[PDB]
Amino acid sequence: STEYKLVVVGADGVGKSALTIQLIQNHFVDEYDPTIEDSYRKQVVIDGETCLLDILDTAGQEEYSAMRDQYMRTGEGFLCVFAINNTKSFEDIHHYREQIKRVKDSEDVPMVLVGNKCDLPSRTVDTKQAQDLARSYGIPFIETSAKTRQGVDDAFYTLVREIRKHKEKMSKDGKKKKKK
């Protein structure tokens, strides 16, 4: 029944597409084909609810700011992807969260922090530093591999769950009403 708008964001090459395609098509894309923008639809059942997932897969780097602003306005939930062997991509997470909060003019935006490529031996970003970042934001953290598929379903489902909690909150939130 319910429709969720998920936006996958992150630096160049972190595996945004591979994750999405693992979720949708159940196979690992070995090729590196830079994204402009891709729109996907998946129907899953989560906690006994049929969810229509509208997933936007975004570019590592947008040439026009206005194109970034557009998906930051529309997205209900954001999957914030870094690669565990890419320190810069991890540092970029802060900037994505800030721009999203600016654009939403809001402190509460459902997000999940995703550390991808956990199958690699080339780690430069420690689980702990990533856990601590998520804890600071008040969001879930999940490590994944689009190659092995570890954590993939979980990352997306958790995001859906975060959106639900925010809707629940939003209703009762927070000083200007609100219900229950």
Ligand X SMILES: Nc1nc2c(ncn2[C@@H]2O[C@H](COP(=O)(O)OP(=O)(O)CP(=O)(O)O)[C@@H](O)[C@H]2O)c(=O)[nH]1
Ligand Y SMILES: Cc1[nH]c2cc(Cl)cc(Cl)c2c1CCN
Window 41-60: residues binding ligand X (CB under 6 A): 59-60
Partners of 50 in beta bridges: 45
Residue where the block lists tokens 């992150």: 10
Q: Counting contacts by CB under 6 A, is residue 7 touching ligand Y?
A: yes
- For residue 39, the partner it binds in ligand Y, Mg ion, ligand X, none, with Cβ less than 5 to 8 A by kind, is ligand Y
Residue of 117, 121, 161 lying closest to 11 (CA atoms)? 117
SS3 assignment, position 111: strand
Q: Counting contacts by CB under 6 A, is residue 164 touching ligand X?
A: no
Least CB distance to ligand Y at residue 18 (A): 18
| DSSP assignment string, 115-167 | EE-TT-S---S-HHHHHHHHHHHT--EEE--TTT-TTHHHHHHHHHHHHHHHH
Least CB distance to ligand X at residue 13 (A): 5
Q: Counting contacts by CB under 6 A, is residue 17 touching ligand X?
A: yes
Which CB sits closer to ligand X, 56 or 166? Answer: 56
Window 115-134: residues binding ligand X (CB under 6 A): 116-117, 119-120
Q: Counting contacts by CB under 6 A, is residue 146 touching ligand X?
A: yes
Q: What distance in Å separates the CA atoms of residue 29 and residue 53, rounded to the nearest whole number?
A: 21
Name the site residues for ligand X (rule: CB under 6 A).
12-18, 29-30, 32-35, 59-60, 116-117, 119-120, 145-147
